[PDB]
Design a protein around this nucleic acid. Sequence first.
DNA 1: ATGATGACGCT
DNA 2: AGCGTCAT
Length: 425
Amino acid sequence: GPHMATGQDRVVALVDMDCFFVQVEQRQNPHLRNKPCAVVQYKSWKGGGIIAVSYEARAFGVTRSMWADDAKKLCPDLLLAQVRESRGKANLTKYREASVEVMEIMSRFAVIERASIDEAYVDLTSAVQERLQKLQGQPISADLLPSTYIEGLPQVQKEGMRKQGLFQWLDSLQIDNLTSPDLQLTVGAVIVEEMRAAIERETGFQCSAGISHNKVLAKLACGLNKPNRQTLVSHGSVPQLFSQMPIRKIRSLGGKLGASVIEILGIEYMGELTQFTESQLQSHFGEKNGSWLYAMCRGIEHDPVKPRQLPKTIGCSKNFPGKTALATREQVQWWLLQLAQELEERLTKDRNDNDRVATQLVVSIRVQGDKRLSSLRRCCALTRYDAHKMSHDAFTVIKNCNTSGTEWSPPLTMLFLCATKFSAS
DNA sequence: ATGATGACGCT
DNA sequence: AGCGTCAT
Ligand SMILES: Nc1ncnc2c1ncn2[C@@H]1O[C@H](COP(=O)(O)OP(=O)(O)OP(=O)(O)O)[C@@H](O)[C@H]1O
Ligand SMILES: [Ca+2]
């Protein structure tokens, strides 16, 4: 009772750019704005692979991973923008640079953890404290939360429902209690409105966001009202929210562990986990996983927002599917050179921008036949940012994996070069 | 014939 | 070190 921690110590947000690559291409090309459109990678095989889809095109059933030729069957008017191709591979530089635009704005408000090219977590606890002292027990106006949903409220127009729930929420806040977790989340949402307004003003890009007490709840919250909206998930909203929430929706439970929770326990929803002891969960899923599940199904998680705005590794990969699999030594060598040249370009920019140098090169390949991501990984020293040296070193490291040949057997269906172990410079 | 990339866990 | 998992 009085000694059971409730996981309400922090205010955490997750910001997620809406259909990010589409927004980048729509900013650049106004003819794509407010249209069903998608971004496509490559072109020859079935019109290319769709990597991002505007919300107008999603209404027709267009999805990521679909072939553009197939997407045109669902949406004949679909407009397409093509990812840049350099040295025979997709080049995502435009989107990485757009991501930096957004991340740099977010960093003005708080310490961020880059979670992907277009997501970042925000630890707002200190900014909320400061903003709560600048307020003098002043009530928070609904005008300060013009795109916020309060999950679980109210308890026949979309915006009308949003305001009704927001009104119910604001009407019961303990405004004079500076330590009230619900009040802290509400101020957190005010700051996130300001952060999202600044992103849109300064880049043209819209995003969604979740505000809660931890990263898992903030990420879940973000997806509840997309696009261009933000959602506050309070501690008290967790029992009803989790009571019908498929386990797979919780971050890290979308794969084999989540499937085993469902199968071993015979449950479907996150809230059903509360009926097991911590020891029971640890017995089925291990000490770390069981302790994490025991707390998480109660809305409690302690994973910190890591102060990290830059990636820890810089990598370049390309798949070679079906008949395009690399089957000669000259082929393997040329593509390792192509990847190494793009990697050198990124590394040199990274050293100038971010005052660091990578010291290890990881080479990963996939062999025709294995359903895994990688068949083999080996490392070597990375001492000079030179594409010819890196590709020669990568070959030497993987040369012995060749059965016999001028020929390369079995053929390679993936090449991957990753620079790691950065040191300041 | 998805594809590109990145974090972190386990041993 | 090298492999497996999970994610955008
Ligand atoms: N299966 C995948 N393969 C490759 N890249 C992916 C994949 N899923 C996500 N990504 C990368 O993450 C970026 C953001 O993906 P996300 O799932 O957030 O979709 P989105 O296009 O931003 O739409 P939403 O509005 O739903 O967020 C994508 O542009 C892509 O670069
Ligand atoms: Ca996104």
